[model samples]
Target: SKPFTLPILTLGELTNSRFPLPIDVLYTNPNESAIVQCQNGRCTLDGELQGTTQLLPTGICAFRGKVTQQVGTHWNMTVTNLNGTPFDPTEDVPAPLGTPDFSGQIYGVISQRNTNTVPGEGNLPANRAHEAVIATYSPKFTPKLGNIQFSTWETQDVSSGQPTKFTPVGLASVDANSHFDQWTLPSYSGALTLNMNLAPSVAPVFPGECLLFFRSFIPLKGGYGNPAIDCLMPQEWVQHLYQESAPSLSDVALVRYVNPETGRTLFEAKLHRNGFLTVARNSAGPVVAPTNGYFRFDSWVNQFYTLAPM
Candidate 1:
């Protein structure tokens, strides 16, 4: 049938037979078609394709029904109805890389990705698309009225030319069933103006429940005096009375004024209601009007007010 021919084997001769084919020569084909070329750029598959395929620089070949016409730069594919099957192109397909670069520093234009436009403010150019700037300042101060002292008892007792004493300390009940009014010393002192609802039958004493008492005597200036006790009320001058009530505006406790010749503690504050209690003559400078002492609140609880110096 002209299919079994193996009888022309020689190694040297020309023009009539052997040219050179003394050994290796094997050609067996059942249905051959194999073109596999893809080393490392990966994209393999060309042994005839049934499932695992992908090696494309250019491709087109589908036999048995004809379509073969787009041959190789390096993507040589050729596969038919494989019977023994064994042609591995190594399975390749790789390539895909690019994207990177962004550093920092920039300040203007607070935002613009899709539409709330603000295209006009300046200064913001240092790198990666800009956005970052901080700088702040703030400052304030306001409080005037440094030295003020108002008076109304005729006003002469700047330090004591005399006559600015008004001591009345609580007591005035006329109606919750009446009868109370005893602490006094105002037979006549002149030009007074310290009234805060002074006795309309008296019933409003809300600054720390009342406590006003007074007594003064500070005259020991080198006086081995001509005849003794000219005005000696100094059994330490007995001073007591305070007031600062009302929802706790706090501070009103005065009764300690020691110095019976040096027991020390002269005027320890706790006053703050109608506020003002400075009695310093030389215990350290400034503040000596009638020797200073002005308490308030005269009757919210039976009595507890002050002013100082009998």
Candidate 2:
């Protein structure tokens, strides 16, 4: 109970600027939730004080522990000494995904579901067997319209030891019109496979600490959204993906993120497991929005998918 999970910060300009521009990532970039602990009732990162519990005046618990690679260890996250030794978190900690390369077995704890079952409704609760995946996303230019065609061509299966080989079997594209970041294949690939497409994520990413932002489905599915406004926006959201082949990358995946401040996506990389990807954003703007710095999902108007335990 001491080490509370981190609140994923999911906000962005994926709906108005560029292809529907975006916002601030969240408390800590919206994607990482590090494990925190205390030693004899005290915790420190690089000698910095961490969160505190009732017994300890100040210890690294929930709002504690800095996101540092300085010299520490909590959950699967590990930071090393300025020289090279790794800090001791708990002597019995699980094997970390390796290093801050963002490689680890993570899970998605979802809340708030939007239940509009029809004309504009999404993600029916009765719907089980959720699916999720990690894919490579990119922008394509069409000669027809200087429009940027966002496409997720391949998905890697990292739920196991060897990942997966590329194939067109798990490929998909999104509709340029739906305000709902929804996509499907005639074969209904489920959520597994390489799908781009939603929530707080590493923008123009490579393999490092990633960020993601999940929001509510705005402009109701059937409601004429901003009658005079419309465009295909890409929010970094992930959900349950399914696959018959050994569960595959449907549960574990690698992703990238775009740096809003840079007006460009940095080349970063990371490997994680168990989280769904979706396309949706809640409120917007200053008075138009609030920088609460946490990932919020309107369970009401959206659907949720889930893969099994990784």
Candidate 3:
């Protein structure tokens, strides 16, 4: 079955910058996944009603928003409230299609099929495939000091989901140089050399998370298709898609939501301590009361000590 919800994990710009809001967008047109359905005080994707609260990787309630209109390729919506508090819309501006008015912003999705493989430096493994989607875009800004440069990425297992390890494996210079601007390299398996300074940095930082974060650059390149791009998330959501390791030996590809700025590990879909590959959030925080805040596209209910509610 086709997925109706597009889970977008983004850094909060106007809101709190510490949290990553995993927004679940419900769309109507599966053929063209960006066309939203909003009417009669209800919005849906593929006929499923959606009024859920947005959640952070920590399983905390960030906020709630919905598709109010389908303008151009962007889905125009408003932040209805923050942590169950009502809000007011101030813009009251009338704008054209494809662009949102001043009082609101839009979510534009770019979907692509990604085939990722280990970097050629080592004994290269077979190609791994996943359906990647870049659902949000952020503006480019100048790089700063200590901002890690994404170089190469590697996974622990042949499984695929979200990423877990991001090491600064290939690059030597740590300072943000002018050469770090070329994010969209030409080759599909090429390495990325961009910097993230003011962008959101998930906690539990160390030295090696940047390389794993850099691995996402390849998939992002396929999804965004731009050179001077700054920030975008290439999320792997399709459950049935997986890379074949062997005839009878296969595992889900591991995936991670990394904070490249501080080399912090945010979220990961790796093999848990309980011996199953699962999606988990690594941030240190208390889990909030679950309302419509937490929703799952898959029936993943296993909870690890290191994982938050998904």
Kindly list the per-residue Cα lDDT of model 2 for residues 1-310, writing each as its tens digit. Answer: 1211212433543321111223322211324243211111111111111111112111111111112111111111112221223434332221110111111111111111223345443534222111211121211211011111111212321122111111111112222432122211111111232212112221312222222322222222122332111111122221011111112222223332334344342322222232322221222221122443232322211112332211
Task: Name the TM-score of candidate 1.
Answer: 0.13
- Model 1: ten consecutive residues of lowest lDDT: 95-104
User: Tens-digit lDDT track for model 1 on 24-139?
Assistant: 11111112132111111111011111111122211111011111122201111122221213222232211000000000010111111221224463533221111211110000
Candidate 2: stretches off by over 4 Å: 1-247, 250-252, 258-265, 276-310
* Top candidate, metric TM-score: 3
Among all windows of 10 consecutive residues in model 3, the one with the lowest summed lDDT is 95-104
Assess the local accuracy of residue 96 in candidate 1 as a C-alpha lDDT between 0 and 100: 9
TM-score: the better of candidates 1 and 2: 2
Candidate 1, residue 206: CA error in Å? 13
- Count of backbone collisions within predicted model 3: 22
TM-score of each: 0.13, 0.17, 0.17
